[PDB]
Design a protein around this nucleic acid. Structure first.
Lengths: 82, 94, 109, 96, 82, 96, 109, 94
DNA sequence: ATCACAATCCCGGTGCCGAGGCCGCTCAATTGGTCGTAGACAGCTCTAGCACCGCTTAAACGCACGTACGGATTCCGTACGTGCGTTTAAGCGGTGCTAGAGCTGTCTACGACCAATTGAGCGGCCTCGGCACCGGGATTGTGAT
DNA sequence: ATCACAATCCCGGTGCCGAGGCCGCTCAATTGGTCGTAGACAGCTCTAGCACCGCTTAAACGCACGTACGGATTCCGTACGTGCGTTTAAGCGGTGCTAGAGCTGTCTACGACCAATTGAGCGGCCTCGGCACCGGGATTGTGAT
């Protein structure tokens, strides 16, 4: 039973993502806010991907399950088969 | 002029169950008819894609239930699944 | 010689039409075949969602001291319920208006 | 000792990470996060390796996209520092 | 041949729309900016609605043509048949 | 002579128009605008009366929706007055 | 006795497969019937859009002094062309990166 | 294992036409295959709805052309219509 | 607080448009028998997903210093809100014309269906060569003098 | 301007694995004949869309006054950026176990199809009643004293 893995998304990792986004200066309260937003995004995608997996009577989440889940949420991903 | 079909007789029957002394205007009835047609195509479209992904030629009650879980949020999806399962069970028994 | 017909809706205990929904599933080019339980399940779901909106809209009409549900009442019912507001998030209700909402910084001091 | 002025290295880092395409979150702690979240939906799930990678590519793209909208909100308030109220404004206008 | 009908969207009309939107104070440059935004919105919807009309070999734009055009732009409208 | 302070009538107007549902643009000049725009796509077009009404209901709903997002941008900049840069920021974040 | 076969793609002067596209239209539950001209038109449109992207992506690879097109070159081709950026506005290209863009107020004075 | 189909042989032939001395990586070929499948379902879906709106049971060249005009922006739609019309004309002539 | 005041809510009496109730008929749902096949099931293979071990540095974490950015304050003049008189034009009701959309029956061009056949496309190998890695050389822009 | 300096682009040698080319084979595209039917088409009907006129006030427009909000300036103190030493854990390579996903053949329940039949739903009328309009009274919050 895994626990507290959201802190593995470190402060230097969040800063690198902000730099690719063009951000020059970052307040200290950004890091907890970003972890909450990422957790909300991941829970929504994974819930639909597991729903596709359970409908197929499988026990393994495939890349196609993730691609279908992203597509129905309006965020189409190219490069993994769909 | 050809005959026009709608859900208005069924919407009125549901309204009398939940609010026996309440009516509905013709404009609001037009809103409810468009709502039912909208939700129908959303569910049937997702059920069609689910059968296509799994290489099945038949849309069953399993595909409808999965499409409901994908489309409806939270507690609405949970109660809708219970209503659909109960109706299929009663239909099967007789 | 044959038994008297009894509707599929009454067999399932529903008010929404099972036989009509089955016809609309077949002619909508959704799949090659449609199973028997699929229009029963779909009619039950459509009936449930209709009853949820009409319950909240009837309460809004009673709060406005009106007998008849109008499109304003449907808009108030949908936008004040979080799950229905999520479900109909990209939908415009004609003659629906908006919720009363004034940002607190605009109020007099 | 030599010292760069504040903001000089940050502008260098923006030019480093905008020309490159590698993932910016470490792979193993992201995989642990995905498996933790999935436990609340179904126990004893397995994951294909490409399924986790597709999740990471989508997540990094979403966060980078949100940070550019966040940066426009801060500049609109005549700031160069992004704050939590900038993130909340961007997500409200997006409809999230 | 009609011309310059965008000025029929008057300043009191734009103010009334802003009031329904909760706006308390309005700068003088808002009114010309709003007219440009409305013209862009109307051109996009009407172009698709006429495309549905021409495909049906019709000369009259119907309410259903407008409803289909709004739906494909992600702006579903209830109350006119769809 | 009696005079209300600036902002008192504006707050009264917000309460008036948020509680009612009628269209706020005059019907005849909107119809002329629709017919003008449609001339560039096909000449000698006709319109059903309900088609023009559906266009007006969609347009007023779009503009009211844009003005609430515009108002949030102005408040974010510690202003109570909406400006063209507020509209432009809201449309950029929306993706228009 | 019968004439030698000659493909529908070569009849239409196309590189994309007309016969495969017709089969995909038939089994996709799009309609009851599919006309003969429809897969010809669809294959021509798909071939045209492919050629536009590959032309711009090949130019981006040459500007980066590379022989082979990689996903970075496809992303640079799409995001620098206004119409293609509108077509693929809700699409994430894996390993594509972003365009170089720094807001002018962040530059040193 | 069953055979897998893709558009990679056709994408390569188009690439050799526009850039004869340029190759493509396997990852970028995966992008192009997903792009073609994406645009295919977009056009075929809109063509399906167009036939349903007009009570037709056949998807023809006319439905594909209208779907292209609805889906593609500006100058891309104009040139794509010209390419489709030219290919149908040459197919008809022989 | 206090008083005058303009705007709005609430109560009541009529008129009226709109919704609910009723008829008949016709179209579509239901029933029953028949057949065909899509999908469930038991079993097997073999693929890849998981758990573990041991390093090897790349990356993260804590800490000190100080730069410069965010926030608070003050002041002012510029832009809008409010109110009023006058003019414009939208909304409404009626009235011709007629353009065009829906409907009917018929026939043909077109598309489905099916049986053989061959050639196009996919999986599996082999090997050139484009790309990546490492090691200087020369800039190139930054920062204090 | 100028000099020292740290980061980065560039050139070159070279190893490596990834892409392109080639071959077996097998599956699906093509051809030919046959028939079913969807749709084009010529014509009719009828209905609603357009154009015009004549009022009737509701709304828009310009203008004056004055309030208060946006923007510019100054100051400060707080919180992040930069850099450095130390610790930790991610990445990688190999190695077992085994869980589970794809494939094969068979069989049975389920779904399509088709012909009668009746009953449910829709279009058309009729008329109670809920809602809107208008007039009067009571609050009710705003603004100057």
């Amino acid at each position: 039973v895994l626990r507290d893995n959201i802190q593995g998304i470190t402060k230097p990792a969040i800063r690198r993502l902000a730099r690719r986004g063009g951000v020059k200066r970052i307040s200290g309260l950004i890091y907890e806010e970003t972890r909450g937003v990422l957790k909300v995004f991941l829970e929504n995608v994974i819930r639909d991907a597991v729903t596709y997996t359970e409908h197929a009577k499988r026990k393994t989440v495939t890349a196609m399950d993730v691609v279908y889940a992203l597509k129905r949420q309006g965020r189409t991903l190219y490069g993994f088969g769909g | 002029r050809s005959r026009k079909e709608s859900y208005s007789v069924y919407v009125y029957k549901v309204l009398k169950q939940v609010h026996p002394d309440t009516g509905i205007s013709s404009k609001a009835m037009g809103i409810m008819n468009s709502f039912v047609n909208d939700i129908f195509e959303r569910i049937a479209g997702e059920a069609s894609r689910l059968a296509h992904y799994n290489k099945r030629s038949t849309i069953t009650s399993r595909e409808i239930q999965t499409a409901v879980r994908l489309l409806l949020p939270g507690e609405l999806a949970k109660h809708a699944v219970s209503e659909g399962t109960k109706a299929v069970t009663k239909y099967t028994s007789a | 010689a044959r038994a008297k017909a009894k509707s599929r809706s009454s067999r399932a205990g529903l008010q929404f039409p099972v036989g009509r929904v089955h016809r609309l599933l077949r002619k909508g080019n959704y799949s090659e075949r449609v199973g028997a339980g699929a229009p029963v399940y779909l009619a039950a779901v459509l009936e449930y969602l209709t009853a949820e909106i009409l319950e909240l809209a009837g309460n809004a009409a009673r709060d406005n001291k009106k007998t008849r549900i109008i499109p304003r009442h449907l808009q108030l019912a949908i936008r004040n319920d979080e799950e229905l507001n999520k479900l109909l998030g990209r939908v415009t209700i004609a003659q629906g208006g908006v919720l009363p909402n004034i940002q607190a910084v605009l109020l007099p001091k | 000792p030599h010292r760069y002025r504040p903001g000089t290295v940050a502008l260098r880092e923006i030019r480093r990470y905008q020309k490159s395409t590698e993932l910016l979150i470490r792979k193993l702690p992201f995989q642990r996060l995905v498996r933790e979240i999935a436990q609340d939906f179904k126990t004893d799930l397995r994951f294909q390796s490409s399924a986790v990678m597709a999740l990471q590519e989508a997540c990094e793209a979403y966060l980078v996209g949100l940070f550019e909208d966040t940066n426009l909100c801060a500049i609109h308030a005549k700031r160069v520092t992004i704050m939590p109220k900038d993130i909340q404004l961007a997500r409200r206008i997006r409809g999230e």
